[PDB]
Amino acid sequence: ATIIFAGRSNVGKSTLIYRLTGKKVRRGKRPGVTRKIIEIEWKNHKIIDMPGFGFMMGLPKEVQERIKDEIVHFIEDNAKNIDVAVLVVDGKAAPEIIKRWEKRGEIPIDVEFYQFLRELDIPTIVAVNKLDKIKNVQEVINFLAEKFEVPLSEIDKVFIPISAKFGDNIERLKNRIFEVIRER
Numbered sequence: 344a345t346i347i348f349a350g351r352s353n354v355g356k357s358t359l360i361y362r363l364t365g366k367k368v369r370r371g372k373r374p375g376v377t378r379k380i381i382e383i384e385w386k387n388h389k390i391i392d393m394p395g396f397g398f399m400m401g402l403p404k405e406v407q408e409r410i411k412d413e414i415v416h417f418i419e420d421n422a423k424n425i426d427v428a429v430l431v432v433d434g435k436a437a438p439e440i441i442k443r444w445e446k447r448g449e450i451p452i453d454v455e456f457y458q459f460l461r462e463l464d465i466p467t468i469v470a471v472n473k474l475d476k477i478k479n480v481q482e483v484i485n486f487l488a489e490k491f492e493v494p495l496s497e498i499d500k501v502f503i504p505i506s507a508k509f510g511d512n513i514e515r516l517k518n519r520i521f522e523v524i525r526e527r
């Protein structure tokens with residue numbers, strides 16, 4: 344199966360991919376891949392990893408938009424060959440970023456992207472990372488579910504809190520990914 348990973352920069356996506364696969368990606372061995380899509384062999388499956396969305400110092404905002412366009416085009420073009428998507432979010436930061444963006448009338452990246460995947464009928468699991476920094480995870484997940492337009496009945500199927508840093512619930516996230524792939 345093919346699994347795409349996506350998320351804003353610094354949410355812990357490359358760390359999560361390493362916890363899941365034992366393969367270090369985006370650590371510099373390969374320079375010039377910072378703004379590119381990479382493929383990872385995960386036993387007999389394939390992970391296609393999108394460059395992180397959003398701001399990164401040194402990354403001009405025009406290049407930021409270009410990257411986002413490239414990710415959109417790849418996922419639109421390969422949608423029929425994508426079995427499941429994992430959107431990695433930073434559980435501590437995401438709700439507060441969503442609130443400040445809505446205040447100024449902009450659509451938060453996380454919300455925009457999860458809703459985009461839904462328009463494409465791609466089953467999506469949200470890895471709510473950095474659980475070790477989150478004092479009320481249920482509250483965070485309930486907030487994100489309302490902003491992402493996720494039905495109450497589907498919250499526990501969609502939102503999986505983990506700590507890629509310490510390993511918390513990584514096996515549960517792996518089980519979910521494979522369960523979604525099979526159920527598909």
Ligand SMILES: Nc1nc2c(ncn2[C@@H]2O[C@H](COP(=O)(O)OP(=O)(O)O)[C@@H](O)[C@H]2O)c(=O)[nH]1
Nearest residue numbers: 352353354355356357358395472473506507508
């Ligand atoms: N506290 C905490 N920090 C994390 C976790 N996962 C990743 N990080 C930290 O978040 C930063 C970015 O992680 P990285 O995997 O390089 O992010 P990416 O840009 O989304 O690939 C780092 O300093 C990681 O140590 C986590 O679960 N908990």
